[PDB]
Amino acid sequence: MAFRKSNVYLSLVNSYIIDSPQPSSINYWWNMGSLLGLCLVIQIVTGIFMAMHYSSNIELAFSSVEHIMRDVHNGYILRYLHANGASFFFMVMFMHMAKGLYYGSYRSPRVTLWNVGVIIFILTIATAFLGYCCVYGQMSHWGATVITNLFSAIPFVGNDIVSWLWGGFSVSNPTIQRFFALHYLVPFIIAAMVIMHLMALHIHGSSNPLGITGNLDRIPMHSYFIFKDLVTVFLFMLILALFVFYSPNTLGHPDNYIPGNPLVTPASIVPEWYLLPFYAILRSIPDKLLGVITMFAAILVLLVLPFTDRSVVRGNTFKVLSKFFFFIFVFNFVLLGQIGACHVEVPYVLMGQIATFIYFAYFLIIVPVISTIENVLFYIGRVNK
Amino acid sequence: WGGFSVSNPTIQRFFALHYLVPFIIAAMVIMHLMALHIHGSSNPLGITGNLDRIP
Amino acid sequence: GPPSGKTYMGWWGHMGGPKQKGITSYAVSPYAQKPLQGIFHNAVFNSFRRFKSQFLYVLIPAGIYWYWWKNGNEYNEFLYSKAGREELERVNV
Amino acid sequence: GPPSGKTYMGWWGHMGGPKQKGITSYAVSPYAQKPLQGIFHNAVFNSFRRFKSQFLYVLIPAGIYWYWWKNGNEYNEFLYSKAGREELERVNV
Amino acid sequence: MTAAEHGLHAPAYAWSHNGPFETFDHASIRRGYQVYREVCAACHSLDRVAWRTLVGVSHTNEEVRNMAEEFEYDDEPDEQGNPKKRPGKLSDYIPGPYPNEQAARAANQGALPPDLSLIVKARHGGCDYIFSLLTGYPDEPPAGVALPPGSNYNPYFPGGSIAMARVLFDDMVEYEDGTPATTSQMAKDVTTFLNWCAEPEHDERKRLGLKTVIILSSLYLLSIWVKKFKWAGIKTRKFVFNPPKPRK
Amino acid sequence: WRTLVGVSHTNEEVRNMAEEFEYDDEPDEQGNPKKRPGKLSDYIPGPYPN
Amino acid sequence: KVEVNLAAIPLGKNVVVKWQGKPVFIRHRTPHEIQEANSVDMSALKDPQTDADRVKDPQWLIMLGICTHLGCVPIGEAGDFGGWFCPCHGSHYDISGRIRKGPAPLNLEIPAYEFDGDKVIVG
Amino acid sequence: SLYKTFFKRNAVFVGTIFAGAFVFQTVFDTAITSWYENHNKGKLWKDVKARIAA
Amino acid sequence: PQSFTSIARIGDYILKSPVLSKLCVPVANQFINLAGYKKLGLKFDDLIAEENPIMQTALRRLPEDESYARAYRIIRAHQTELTHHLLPRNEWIKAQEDVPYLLPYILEAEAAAKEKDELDNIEVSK
Ligand SMILES: CCCCCCCCCCC(=O)OC[C@H](COP(=O)(O)OC[C@H](O)COP(=O)(O)OC[C@@H](COC(=O)CC)OC(=O)CCC)OC(=O)CCCCCCCC
Ligand SMILES: CCCCCCCCCCCCCCCCCC(=O)OC[C@H](COP(=O)(O)OCCN)OC(=O)CCCCCCCCCCCCC
Ligand code: HEM
Ligand code: HEM
Ligand code: HEM
Ligand code: HEM
Ligand SMILES: COc1c(O)c(C)c(C/C=C(\C)CC/C=C(\C)CC/C=C(\C)CC/C=C(\C)CC/C=C(\C)CCC=C(C)C)c(O)c1OC
Ligand SMILES: CCCCCCCCCCCCCCC(=O)OCCCOP(=O)(O)OC[C@@H](O)COP(=O)(O)OCCCOC(C)=O
Ligand SMILES: CCCCCCCCCCCCCCCCCC(=O)O[C@H](COC(=O)CCCCCC)COP(=O)(O)OCCN
Ligand SMILES: CO/C=C(/C(=O)OC)c1ccccc1Oc1cc(Oc2ccccc2C#N)ncn1
């Protein structure tokens, strides 16, 4: 045989990106997974080169980042590609998960592939939280104060988890030094989960936008989907370059250019845009212990979808009622992000409580009821009785 | 050096490289165990082991 | 190594679908075809029906949520002005 | 997946050796044996011949290198004393 | 919140560095430094700017050497161990008017004037907010507003009560190139100088971005042609079904 | 100073030893520097300034 | 822990410390304002609190000051009747901090301050 | 024929895309810098120093 | 997930009711025409997900002349989808051709698996 199939290390390359059989009818939504692999390489490589110039002491952390912007050769390119690249990583990941909801990719036999992806999403959220602390701006200090104080409401162990997380009595110098060391490590755990994610995908292959079997017409990966992947790689890099060079502070907050002061509270404490819907869910529960449980339940409720979908058809292509309620769920997610950036005022308090209910009722009430009705309408529209 | 001698930019870049290379070592160990799974281990007599194996 | 478990996809030659009989296919080399014959007859009629047979599943949920956000933003603006001062003490109870 | 290349080891049932015929083996359960008949008849005679049929391949190279290091250490000690001062200018030329 | 607690919105002015192909106006940067030395520097520090960064941007090399030699800095102690002083050089940073924070609050009735090295990027509004604050002091507050003693009214400040007074008046600075020094001219020049202090890479970043966008646009348009060429055999494929004969 | 307690001296013996040296303090409301006697958090001082 | 002895504290000026990262707005009280806190009864506020549960000892007034929500700091001696005011929220503080002169009904905290004989230990 | 003199011999089809890219860097950087400075004439420091000579 | 025995039990109850078959049956005809699978040349039983043991049993027992015709309809629908077109209107599936050809094989395999499960977890009494 050829050397790409007989060698021990090249046969893994050949069976994944060269000779792997793809369904002939997948569209451009199936290109988001390879863009996420490019984003992870960009975040790791710009991370190492900035870490050669960074100091994690609380007296030196803010001035180290200003030293990178002013004194390091091409240092402003390294930071702006890193900060804007984190926002592009979350946008591609949101579209990748929404493709899986629409086409039914979570269903059997791909449940293990969907469960490993939910773990990856949790680790990415924790990574971006720890890197934002390392700036030690004014939004960095008070955002870490709000989130770490949530864990003291846990019964019997709460007041000792928080001081074990602080290394002291508040957010201080041991907190920033341990948060930078954890920030180095978790992207390497993410890279190992991506390898386990690709092993489960190799077993069954990909789905297709019609929802039915792809075993009857396959084309190989090399020179068809390699060149289709190049179209979205160059479009991604062009839009990212327009943000890095021409508008580099649009997706950030101007309060993060003030150094962290534990005696002055800002007028508004706002997270980054990709964490705003989970911030509005937390502020809609008045009790403090039930608010942090509901905040973590908003991620873990993705695991109930293989059991609450009752349809005998995979995907949303031929279902008009499931199409309508999918886009109700999408614009509800955008509204929750907008409520999370407002003040706690009338009428945004009641609007956030209704939108929180609609988020959880989609997974647990709407999907099993609508998919049961669509099973029966397909039957009685054909059977003569 | 990042400069004219061993100085402050040298120590800061040496600690960042020191964090990284043990993770490259861990990936080479996985490639080391894949090549071992193909042929198995040798034995102290130097001859074939295919006639008597234990799990 | 040991043999694996039972899956629903194979490889080239044993892919795992039903048996095929009676289907013929034809194709022409790309080197013998006309270069780039799409922007027209695809932006004429094809790239309008592909979304405007689908536009009503997107814009009815978009119009519901845009009407709800715009109505709540004008009510918050009224409550913190001079004319909406008396209603503001009533609804913060 | 694709089939692999040709190796020199298989798995249980198809390990890849020659065909066996005519060999019988016997074994007894460990629960029915004496506990720890080990330290005597093995420290008596067995753990002396296992290295003293091998000791001469180790101790002849060890005696060569220990004689060489000890001889050079005494010559360096002589050169930096009072009595070896005159030889020291001669050999540092 | 009310409109007074948020602050009045700052309008958009036609700054000559707005746009993807524009650089700073370097004559406006040079006049802006003169407004800093004669007005602002009595109470504000500029701690993140070194003297060497002004060479080739607003001043010549021997002009900056004479400017830094009018301040004295700490030196290494002598052979007995007593401290010394020395005049400044190009490696030094521009010094501030106060030794510590407690002396700064004691000279300004308890208020602390912030460092201005990053003030354009640290406020919502940017150059438009800094310009509207300086030229936006009314002669008296609106009817009903009672300011505490020691504060002043400015509608662009959130809350309306600011601890700094109006500092710019007509013809308080004599310019070198002969520009008339009105209130609107001096506020425009010092805002341009403060934007360079926050973004010194600005002229280089826009030149490097033009090369990157042109190269990445060409690679995007070429990949569409190459993908459509290599897919044309699959896209025009045709199928025909003839039902097989039974009994097999 | 705190490391000597329970090893070689009692707690009030070390408090009297550290109170015979003066350390730098935070400046006053005008910004002028001050001094203060030592405590158990301080380190043992040396005989030379540099 | 913080140990400051009794005679050094002034009455009209503030000895606010950032002890353990808490701003602690405290005072030497003297007697002239131990009856400036019973005049508003509990008929306006939700907590069963009175001055006997506020302070141990009417000579020395000490209470801790972050913010029932986030933590901003007030301006000194500019209040409605003998108190403080952060412009955070309308956060109007009286003597020893009883809000419900704005939105927040809960009052914050008393630090663990202890006498072992003319020696107060905040902690 | 101009396929076989430019893109057949793939000892230099890897080569010419590796050598045409070397001279491409200096011509491209000279053309953009000249356009960028002419669009912003009268605002650079070299246009300022030419009449702050006094 | 929902079995076809449960779908047929609900659906046959509606079709026998003279008042429920006047309300739901006009709504079901508009639902199928808006789905659009017939414009790609498919019947509904081509759309059923097959990666489960009940559906693999029913596909083995299908007669071979119907198995050849099912394979051609699936292949033709994949080629039409990648060109972003529809079939010509004279090649659409008509309503009198959209019959449940696979449904009796599915219901027979479901009843045999239910009887086996009841005999494997069973009680006795003297
Ligand atoms: C954020 C930074 C990441 C940047 C890269 C991410 C790209 C995300 C875009 C979303 C996506 O991936 O799905 C795209 C989908 C179209 O999928 P399709 O296969 O059915 O269309 C094949 C086409 O007919 C032939 O496309 P063809 O291959 O013939 O030509 C390529 C085309 C550009 O293609 C692309 O760039 C794909 C993104 O070139 C031209 O337009 C020629 C004129 C210059 O579009 C749709 O289904 C609906 C359209 C609107 C979607 C926007 C929603 C965004 C939230
Ligand atoms: C806990 C995490 C929760 C994650 C939730 C994620 C929410 C983030 C929002 C992501 C938006 C992604 C929506 C689209 C998802 C892709 C899947 C999809 O909807 O299919 C494409 C759809 C189908 O089109 P066809 O009918 O032609 O194809 C059928 C197959 N033969 O064709 C279409 O209709 C495409 C139309 C897309 C319009 C969507 C507008 C979204 C606006 C969001 C703006 C957000 C920033 C403000
Ligand atoms: C999945 C990978 C990563 C993500 C999502 C991520 C995210 C972030 C974010 C959001 C910030 C704050 C940026 C800002 O607003 O200024 C940040 C800062 C930082 N990160 Fe990362 N990061 C990743 C990987 C890494 C790695 C692997 C390293 C080091 C080896 C690293 C080093 C740094 C440093 C030094 C900073 C501070 C400098 C700065 O503010 O840009 N990052 N990171
Ligand atoms: C760093 C993060 C990730 C990487 C690198 C990655 C990579 C990939 C790739 C390359 C594919 C195959 C091509 C494709 O369908 O796009 C894929 C498929 C898939 N991924 Fe991810 N992924 C990531 C995160 C996630 C997340 C967060 C989820 C869900 C919560 C997820 C769920 C899935 C599913 C269900 C599929 C199968 C889609 C199908 O077959 O139709 N992945 N992934
Ligand atoms: C972190 C470093 C390493 C790890 C974890 C590792 C691990 C292992 C393990 C578990 C085995 C099988 C069991 C055994 O024979 O002991 C093995 C075999 C082997 N290793 Fe390593 N090894 C490492 C470094 C090295 C190095 C530095 C060399 C040589 C330069 C090497 C060469 C070999 C060879 C030749 C074998 C086969 C031995 C035989 O089959 O008789 N390894 N290794
Ligand atoms: C042209 C001269 C000056 C400029 C451009 C300038 C600029 C600024 C800016 C941008 C702020 C921040 C406003 C904000 O927080 O939004 C500020 C605050 C302040 N400045 Fe000025 N400054 C100048 C001169 C002065 C002078 C001469 C004094 C004192 C005699 C002064 C005292 C203060 C004080 C006390 C504050 C803090 C006010 C507060 O926080 O309420 N400044 N200045
Ligand atoms: C269904 O068919 C498919 C399919 O559709 C796709 C898209 C893929 C696509 C595959 C991918 C997208 C790969 C996934 C991406 C990763 C696993 C990236 C992992 C990240 C890393 C390995 C990061 C490592 C980075 C470094 C080591 C850089 C370190 C920096 C250094 C050394 C600085 C240099 C130091 C000095 C001193 C100069 C398939 O494999 C596949 O088959 C299953
Ligand atoms: C033509 C290309 C041009 C451009 C396009 C692409 C360019 C970029 C190249 C992409 C990089 C290569 C492709 C990705 C790849 O190979 O990784 C995914 C495959 C890894 O998964 P795996 O092979 O299943 O794991 C590996 C497994 O299959 C085998 O098991 P094993 O790992 O041996 O377990 C040993 C661990 C022991 O564990 C213990 C000891 O407990
Ligand atoms: C931790 C995740 C691990 C993921 C593993 C993914 C695989 C990554 C490999 C990427 C491609 C590497 C190309 C290898 C080149 C061909 C291998 C080879 O030359 O093997 C040998 C020569 O041996 C070597 O020198 C190994 C080189 C070390 C490579 C370390 C990077 C080729 O000779 P051989 O005939 O034995 O090949 C058949 C093997 N079955
Ligand atoms: C250090 O501050 C980090 C912030 C940030 O945005 O990081 C990227 C942040 C800033 C201000 C306010 C809050 C901030 O952090 C966060 C953190 C956060 O975390 C979760 C997200 C989803 C589910 C659970 C949690 C938690 N905890 N959800 C929302 N905001």
Domain at D3, CATH number: 1.20.5.210
Do A161 and A87 meet the contact criterion of CB atoms below 8 Å apart? no
**Of A140, A165, A168, which is closest to residue A154 (Cα–Cα)?**
A165
Tokens of F43: 């380190």
- Name the burial class of residue D4, with classes exposed (0-12), middle (13-18) and buried (19+) by CB atoms within 10 angstroms of its CB: middle
- Ligand 7 lined by A44 (C-beta under 6 Å): yes
Is the alpha carbon torsion for G7, G11, G16, G19 positive or negative? Answer: positive
Structural domain containing residue D39: 1-93
**Of A331, A340, A350, A345, which is closest to residue A281 (Cα–Cα)?**
A340
- Where does residue E140 fall: left (phi above 0), alpha (psi -120 to 50 degrees), or beta otherwise? beta
Say how far apart CA E105 and CA E108 lie, in whole Å: 5
Domains and CATH numbers, chain E: 4-200 (1.10.760.10), 201-245 (1.20.5.100)
Backbone angles phi, psi at E194, to 5 degrees: -75, -25
The reply to whether omega before A109 is within 30° of 0 (cis) is yes
Do A136 and A143 meet the contact criterion of CB atoms below 8 Å apart? no
Say how far apart CA A208 and CA D65 lie, in whole Å: 72
CATH of the domain at G73: 2.102.10.10
Number of domain units in chain C: 1
Number of domain units in chain I: 1
Interval between CA E164 and ligand 6 midpoint (Å): 5
One-letter identity of residue A142: W
- Chain A to chain C Cβ contacts (< 8 Å): 61
Say how far apart CA E229 and CA E219 lie, in whole Å: 16
Contact residues on chain I for E239, CB-CB shorter than 8 A: 72, 75-76, 79
Structure determination method? cryo-EM
User: Where does chain E have alpha helices with state H?
Assistant: 3-6, 26-38, 61-68, 101-106, 127-134, 183-198, 202-230, 232-235
Structural domain containing residue G29: 1-123
Report the residue of G64, G72, G91 to disrupt the A interface, i.e. the one with the largest count of A CBs within 10 Å. Answer: G72
Do E167 and E194 meet the contact criterion of CB atoms below 8 Å apart? no
Q: Per-residue DSSP letters for chain F?
A: -GGGBTTTB-HHHHHHHHTTSEEE----TTS---EEE--TTSPPPPS---
Contact of I67 with chain C, judged by CB distance below 8 Å, is answered with: yes
Is the alpha carbon torsion for A4, A6, A8, A13 positive or negative? Answer: positive
Experimental resolution (Å): 2.3
Say how far apart CA E227 and CA H24 lie, in whole Å: 25
Chain E: closest CA distance from residue C3 (Å): 34
Angle at I112 between CA I106 and CA I115, to 5 degrees: 140
- Where does residue A167 fall: left (phi above 0), alpha (psi -120 to 50 degrees), or beta otherwise? left
Chain A: closest CA distance from residue E170 (Å): 32
Contact of I82 with chain E, judged by CB distance below 8 Å, is answered with: yes
The reply to whether omega before A347 is within 30° of 0 (cis) is yes
Tokens of A60: 């030196």
**Helix, strand, coil distribution of chain E in percent, nearest 5:** 40, 5, 55
What's the residue count for chain C? 93
A184–B19 CB contact, under 8 Å: yes
Q: How many CB atoms lie within 10 A of CB A67?
A: 16
What's the residue count for chain H? 54
Centroid of chain to Cα D62 = 13
Backbone angles phi, psi at C47, to 5 degrees: -90, 45
Angle at C66 between CA C60 and CA C70, to 5 degrees: 150
Angle at E97 between CA E94 and CA E99, to 5 degrees: 100
Q: Which residues contact C84 (CB under 8 A, 6 or more apart)?
A: C78
One-letter identity of residue G30: T
Angle at C19 between CA C14 and CA C23, to 5 degrees: 115
Say how far apart CA G14 and CA G5 lie, in whole Å: 15
Say how far apart CA E10 and CA E122 lie, in whole Å: 15
Measure the N-to-C terminal CA separation of chain E; round to a whole number of Å: 83
Tokens of A219: 């084309």
Tokens of A276: 């705003």
**E197 in a labelled binding site:** no
Do A186 and B19 meet the contact criterion of CB atoms below 8 Å apart? no
State the pairing for strand pair G120-122/G113-115.
antiparallel
Tokens of A172: 């201080």
One-letter identity of residue A19: D
Q: How many CB atoms lie within 10 A of CB G57?
A: 11
Q: What are the Cα distances from residue E18, in Å, to D31, E205, H40, I23?
A: 89, 14, 12, 64
Say how far apart CA D31 and CA C6 lie, in whole Å: 40
One-letter identity of residue D67: Y
Delimit the domains of chain H by residue range.
1-54
Backbone angles phi, psi at G91, to 5 degrees: -75, 85
Q: Per-residue DSSP letters for H8-41?
A: S-TTTHHHHHHHHHHHHHHHHHHHHHHHHHHHTT
Q: Per-residue DSSP letters for G85-111?
A: EETTTTEE--TT----SSS-----B--
Number of domain units in chain A: 1
Which residue of A lies nearest to G65 if distances are taken between CA atoms?
A263
E21–H48 CB contact, under 8 Å: no
Do C65 and A334 meet the contact criterion of CB atoms below 8 Å apart? yes
- Catalytic center residues of G: 89
Q: How many CB atoms lie within 10 A of CB D66?
A: 11
Chain E: closest CA distance from residue H45 (Å): 6
Say how far apart CA A31 and CA A226 lie, in whole Å: 10
Backbone angles phi, psi at G69, to 5 degrees: -125, -60
**Of A120, A77, A96, A80, which is closest to residue A31 (Cα–Cα)?**
A96
- The contacts found for A198-204 with CB under 8 angstroms, 24 or more apart, are A198/A16, A200/A110, A200/A112, A200/A113, A200/A116, A201/A113, A202/A15, A202/A16, A202/A20, A202/D1, A203/C7, A203/C9, A204/A109, A204/A110, A204/A113, A204/C7, A204/C8, A204/C9
Atom of ligand 2 nearest to the CA of I81: 31
Tokens of A61: 């952390």
CATH of the domain at A298: 1.20.810.10
- Ligand 10 lined by A279 (C-beta under 6 Å): yes
Fill in the DSSP letter of residue G57: -
Say how far apart CA A148 and CA A142 lie, in whole Å: 10
Contact of C22 with chain E, judged by CB distance below 8 Å, is answered with: yes
Say how far apart CA C57 and CA A322 lie, in whole Å: 10
Q: Which of A107, A212, A380 sits opposite I47 (nearest CB)?
A: A212
- For the domain bounded by H1-54, which CATH number is listed? 1.20.5.260
Tokens of C27: 């194709």
Q: What are the Cα distances from residue I110, in Å, to E126, E207, I4, I5, I61?
A: 70, 70, 8, 8, 14
Residue with CA closest to ligand 4 atom 43:
A33
Which residue of I lies nearest to C53 if distances are taken between CA atoms?
I34
Which residue of F lies nearest to E108 if distances are taken between CA atoms?
F30
H/E stretch holding E153: strand E152-153
Helix (H/G/I), strand (E/B), else coil: B26: helix
Do C76 and A347 meet the contact criterion of CB atoms below 8 Å apart? yes
- Ligand 2 lined by A278 (C-beta under 6 Å): no
Tokens of A299: 């991620």
**E32: Cα within 13 Å, side-chain hemisphere:** 22
State the pairing for strand pair A218-220/A21-23.
antiparallel
Structural domain containing residue I115: 1-126
I68–C46 CB contact, under 8 Å: no
**G67: Cα within 13 Å, side-chain hemisphere:** 25
What's the residue count for chain E? 248
Say how far apart CA E144 and CA E135 lie, in whole Å: 23
Structural domain containing residue A248: 3-382
Interval between CA A36 and ligand 8 midpoint (Å): 17
Do A333 and A339 meet the contact criterion of CB atoms below 8 Å apart? no
State the pairing for strand pair G120-122/E85-87.
unpaired
Say how far apart CA G46 and CA I78 lie, in whole Å: 70
Do I84 and I78 meet the contact criterion of CB atoms below 8 Å apart? no
Q: Which residues contact E131 (CB under 8 A, 6 or more apart)?
A: E10, E13, E187, E188, E191
**Of E35, E65, E70, which is closest to residue E193 (Cα–Cα)?**
E35
- Exposure string (b/e) for E183-196, b if CB count within 10 Å is 16 or more? bebbbbbbbbbbbb
Q: Which residues contact F22 (CB under 8 A, 6 or more apart)?
A: F35, F36, F37, F38
Q: Which residues contact E34 (CB under 8 A, 6 or more apart)?
A: E173, E175, E176
Contact of A19 with chain C, judged by CB distance below 8 Å, is answered with: yes
Backbone angles phi, psi at F22, to 5 degrees: -115, 145
Say how far apart CA A158 and CA E183 lie, in whole Å: 58
Cross-strand partners of E74: E85
Helix (H/G/I), strand (E/B), else coil: E121: coil
Is the alpha carbon torsion for A249, A250, A251, A257 positive or negative? Answer: positive
**Of A302, A315, A364, which is closest to residue A104 (Cα–Cα)?**
A315
Say how far apart CA G24 and CA A320 lie, in whole Å: 62
Tokens of A123: 């680790």
Say how far apart CA H27 and CA H20 lie, in whole Å: 11
**A121: Cα within 13 Å, side-chain hemisphere:** 22
Q: What is the 3-state secondary structure (H, E, C) of chain A?
A: CCHHHHCCCHHHHHHHHCCCEEECCCCHHHHHHHHHHHHHHHHHHHHHHHHCCCCCCCCCHHHHHHHHHHCCCCHHHHHHHHHHHHHHHHHHHHHHHHHHHHHCCCCCCCHHHHHHHHHHHHHHHHHHHHHHHCCCEHHHHHHHHHHHHHHHHCCCCHHHHHHHHHCCCCCCHHHHHHHHHHHHHHHHHHHHHHHHHHHHHHHHCCCCCCCCCCCCCEEECCCCHHHHHHHHHHHHHHHHHHHHHHCCCCCCCHHHHCECCCCCCCCCCCCCHHHHHHHHHHCCCCCHHHHHHHHHHHHHHHHHHHHHCCCCCCCCCCCHHHHHHHHHHHHHHHHHHHHCCCCCCCCHHHHHHHHHHHHHHHHHHHHHHHHHHHHHHHHHCCCCC
- Exposure string (b/e) for E209-221, b if CB count within 10 Å is 16 or more? bbbbbeebeeebe
Say how far apart CA I79 and CA A139 lie, in whole Å: 53
Say how far apart CA E82 and CA E72 lie, in whole Å: 16
State the pairing for strand pair G2-4/G120-122.
antiparallel
Residue with CA closest to ligand 1 atom 5:
A236
Centroid of chain to Cα E209 = 20
Place of tokens 């695991």: A303
**C28: Cα within 13 Å, side-chain hemisphere:** 9
Q: What are the Cα distances from residue A92, in Å, to A85, A128, A188?
A: 11, 15, 20
Biggest distance spanned by C-alpha atoms of chain A: 81
Rg (CA), chain G: 14
Do A107 and A320 meet the contact criterion of CB atoms below 8 Å apart? no
- The contacts found for A254-259 with CB under 8 angstroms, 24 or more apart, are A254/E121, A254/E122, A254/E123, A254/E124, A255/A137, A255/A138, A255/A139, A255/E122, A256/A135, A256/A137, A256/A138, A256/A139, A256/A140, A257/A137, A257/E118, A257/E121, A257/E122, A258/A137, A258/A138, A258/E122, A259/A62, A259/A136, A259/A137, A259/A138
Contact of A218 with chain D, judged by CB distance below 8 Å, is answered with: no
Cross-strand partners of E86: E73
Do G97 and G108 meet the contact criterion of CB atoms below 8 Å apart? yes
Do A307 and A364 meet the contact criterion of CB atoms below 8 Å apart? no
